Design a protein around this ligand. Sequence first.
Ligand SMILES: [Cl-]
Ligand SMILES: [Cl-]
Ligand SMILES: [Cl-]
Ligand SMILES: [Cl-]
Ligand SMILES: [Cl-]
Ligand SMILES: [Cl-]
Ligand SMILES: [Cl-]
Ligand SMILES: [Cl-]
Lengths: 217, 217
Amino acid sequence: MRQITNLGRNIENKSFSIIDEEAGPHSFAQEEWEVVRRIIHATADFDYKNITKIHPQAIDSGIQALKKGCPIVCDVQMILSGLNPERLKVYGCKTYCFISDEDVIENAKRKNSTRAIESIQKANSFNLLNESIIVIGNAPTALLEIEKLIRQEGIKPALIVGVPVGFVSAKESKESILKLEYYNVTSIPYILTMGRKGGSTIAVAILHALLLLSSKR
Amino acid sequence: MRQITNLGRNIENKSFSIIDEEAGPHSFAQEEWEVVRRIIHATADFDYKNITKIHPQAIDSGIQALKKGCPIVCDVQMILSGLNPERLKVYGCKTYCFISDEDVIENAKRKNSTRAIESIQKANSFNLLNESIIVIGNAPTALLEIEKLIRQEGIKPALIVGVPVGFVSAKESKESILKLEYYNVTSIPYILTMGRKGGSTIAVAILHALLLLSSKR
Ligand SMILES: [Cl-]
Ligand SMILES: [Cl-]
Ligand SMILES: [Cl-]
Ligand SMILES: [Cl-]
Ligand SMILES: [Cl-]
Ligand SMILES: [Cl-]
Ligand SMILES: [Cl-]
Ligand SMILES: [Cl-]
């Protein structure tokens, strides 16, 4: 479930209350607001109240795949190191991150690409991008490879959590997921933070919020 | 060292230059600016250009500690699982984080405190707080206990990287360090992000930046 003192639980509920009060009126649904607020909570940055975008199917589609014990593929290790394994076992979700794998780094140097792009391709070769939750919280090149695989092959992940932070392709990487949404009738559900802002913590924030939402039947 | 494709590097340098051009004129020293920059990088948030405070001895003191394979205590796992062990082994630094421990979790429930405070205490009961680098990145209560120990007892860490993000005591925890600096002729060097903004991501960014500096001398 989760290990946190009753005090910590009080400090947290005390924060969410302040965050709600401060943010002011917003345009999210109850279920959605919880994810947005959770990001604000993880960063003390209120911009995620505006830059955060939640595909209409994002919550259901994601919580559903979570219960099926679907896999969770992250681009950077930190994201994994932030999830309570105990909470994940309940559903039986397997996690992945080939960013530091031997072959990935070998192909990346050879192909003159990035590790993130190559680990996304590795997860793809094992059919891991299928009906799963892909969390990109650091490498835009990763989120772009997904953009590509979606058009090229049909990869149909359960949910894309594209919140990479960057100054070069971060902005675009997220905009492109929105372009896929425009052209397709039934597009891949997503939760992304538009612009350059994002990061492992933002992603973890989202996962925890989603899990807690699932927990609440 | 650093496993990062030649491509990924050019992406970072392009990022750093963007950060520099955008930031504008600042009041930091060359070496110090690096640390600040690294934070803005990891977050795409330029507020850290104003909220970041670096003690006069924070850089020299912290690097010197690393060189001597000094311990590195963290308040949360997220931070350890974000530092390249390969680089620390060079100086032979040992990484610690008792926030997950059994006794720590226990003592916390009984004392009606937080796992964070109790883990700072356990770390205390090992002489791991002297000439060490204390990296607090999520629990203000951890930084507050550290402050208390600088007062009650004479613990003398080599560097306090106090960047806990929070809403209830974040602002205060960091301020209490500035107080000690005021009342003490010779205080413990710090690198903190004023206000209530912060996070393990910022912590790691600061550490990496430090390590890199260390690697250029
Ligand atoms: Cl809104
Ligand atoms: Cl990237
Ligand atoms: Cl980028
Ligand atoms: Cl990150
Ligand atoms: Cl300045
Ligand atoms: Cl705390
Ligand atoms: Cl707090
Ligand atoms: Cl954090």
